[PDB]
Amino acid sequence: SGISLDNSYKMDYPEMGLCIIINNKNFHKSTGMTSRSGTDVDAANLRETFRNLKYEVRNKNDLTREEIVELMRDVSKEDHSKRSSFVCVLLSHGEEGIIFGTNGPVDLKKITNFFRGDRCRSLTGKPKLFIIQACRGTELDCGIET
Amino acid sequence: ASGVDDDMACHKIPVEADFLYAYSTAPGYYSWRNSKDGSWFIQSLCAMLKQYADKLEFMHILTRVNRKVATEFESFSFDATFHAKKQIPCIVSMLTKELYFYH
Amino acid sequence: ASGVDDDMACHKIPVEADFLYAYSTAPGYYSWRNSKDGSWFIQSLCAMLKQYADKLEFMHILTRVNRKVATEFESFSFDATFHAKKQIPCIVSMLTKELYFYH
């Protein structure tokens, strides 16, 4: 054949891949965390958007930290061989490096480590996209007039 | 040329390669959400994917998301501490190729 | 549409906007340097800018740097702890436009 350049990920596998959306709106009262009004708007918008890109969208609402970890472990153990890519969207409270389950925090690294190239071999070489709507601390940006 | 650290016989990639993290906000900062319309970031992300996913590489789409969030939104709060604030999303790419959602 | 947080009368941008951080390595990781040839990242960055700065947008150049570092380099060490290790650079973009070094 002609010249081959390999500058773009192969996105013509049979399936685009999974789009897992974790939508945490309501937190256990014990945690002190507020309900996240507007997050269902986000989750619905994402489902539509990723549906139109031909992802297999799976939504989960109001997961505990243990449920988040179980979900990601289970998803990482699926056979992704026929999938081009993987997307995970996290909608929750957060701090730098942390996302909240409904009962407490999860380190983001614990979640992403399931998808490392050595631990999820059917995603090795494939793009793994994590979209994170959560705080990363407490700083506020005052902006500048342009 | 020749050296100790290139041209391995057995090809490996980093285990951290081929991840992209599309964060809603810069490191250390709050992220903003409208209780009626959704988060600034997700609203903007979905709008830019709807418009551009059949046309632009993903980093370029995310750059348009950055611009939209940065320019179009500013907080409103009855609390002066939290009023008139801004947000810039933060794209963290460990990708090794261009990503197009189409082929 | 109308709401509290869009279409401000006075245009502001975030103070954190329009930064790009081209880190040599992923968060939490060592970065590797060859004592004779230079760092894996800087050697690769310079090579990709030489080749592509008149041709590609900067995020795309940095993606080629990611690929080069990830695929071409692997450490050599007499210390097993430090031997046969890999590196992926990490592009952190708060840019709001495409960047081309040419016009």
Binding site: - | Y30, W32, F82 | -
Partner: peptide, 4 residues
Amino acid sequence: DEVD
């Protein structure tokens, strides 16, 4: 507007 609320923060996360």
